[PDB]
Amino acid sequence: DLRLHLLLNTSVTCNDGSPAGYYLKESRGSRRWLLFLEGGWYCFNRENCDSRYDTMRRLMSSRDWPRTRTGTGILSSQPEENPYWWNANMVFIPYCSSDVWSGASSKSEKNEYAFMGALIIQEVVRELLGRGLSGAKVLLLAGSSAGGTGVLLNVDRVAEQLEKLGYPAIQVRGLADSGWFLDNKQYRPTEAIRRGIRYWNGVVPERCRRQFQEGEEWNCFFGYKVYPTLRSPVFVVQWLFDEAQLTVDNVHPVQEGLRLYIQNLGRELRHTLKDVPASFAPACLSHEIIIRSHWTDVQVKGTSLPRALHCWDRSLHPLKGCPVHLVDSCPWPHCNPSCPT
């Protein structure tokens, strides 16, 4: 069980003005800290956010959050469930800003909602320093879905924050799960993110912002465009046939046009990962994420994700028998026998 702490700076808030927070389970024998960002889409205008507040309120408010949560998958403390980092200090940061972790805008007389995702991450880090993070050797910022995109948008800012505060010995790294999307043609979305960024006052990493310039910062929400600009080490996990990608593409007895569309999607995704040295990309149709209890089961070329992450740790101290770049080459969902069912 991870225990809830509401932020002591109550001006860093969820959408409705309630305090943001984090769930924490300490492991005093360990200098490793895992900070995990939850996902859950986003909202992009007043009417769209009002609908989310009626039926997805936990993603917009802390008023109903439970006192504890159970750590599962990469957040589990059991060696059998988490061969990678079972002994680490574990932090789960709830997603309550509806902004893909990009916002820095407060509620006011002109704003019905606050969009503070980028500030929430920074304040969690600041408050954890006095709970043991000051002694850390590695801080892994991880996340799934919209939280995986959030890792790409925030990992370098966390690294910069810790350097400026006087903690140069903490190695900051990122793990982005299911947050690597293509701005492709539909079979039968970029406008919504463009409007969202304006509504949130959303911020993107500095080098990427300077490449794309004003009006075009939406480009930095796409992993293949923002990843090359990042200085921190980042491991990318992405299904070749991600269900959320196919949903935005309007894909639901497959004839030739759809077969070619799906094969081309997998080939494009593979191509974008060619120069990503730490990656795990199985040829599966799935929405499953790294906090599920059976995350150990899938393998690419005979290597599981917990093993690849361990090999990544070793590389940051090629390795014989310990690979870090694992991308399937086969061209159709479930051509990998270990895909989830």
Ligand SMILES: C[C@@H](Oc1ccc(-c2ccccc2)cc1)C(=O)O
């Ligand atoms: C479905 C699932 O994942 C994602 C949803 C949206 C995004 C995303 C990507 C690029 C630009 C803006 C938003 C990424 C992942 C979830 O969050 O429930």
Ligand SMILES: *[C@@H]1O[C@H](CO)[C@@H](O)[C@H](O)[C@H]1NC(C)=O
């Ligand atoms: C609380 O957070 C807000 C927004 O980030 C910031 O302006 C303010 O300085 C913070 N307060 C303290 C005491 O750090």
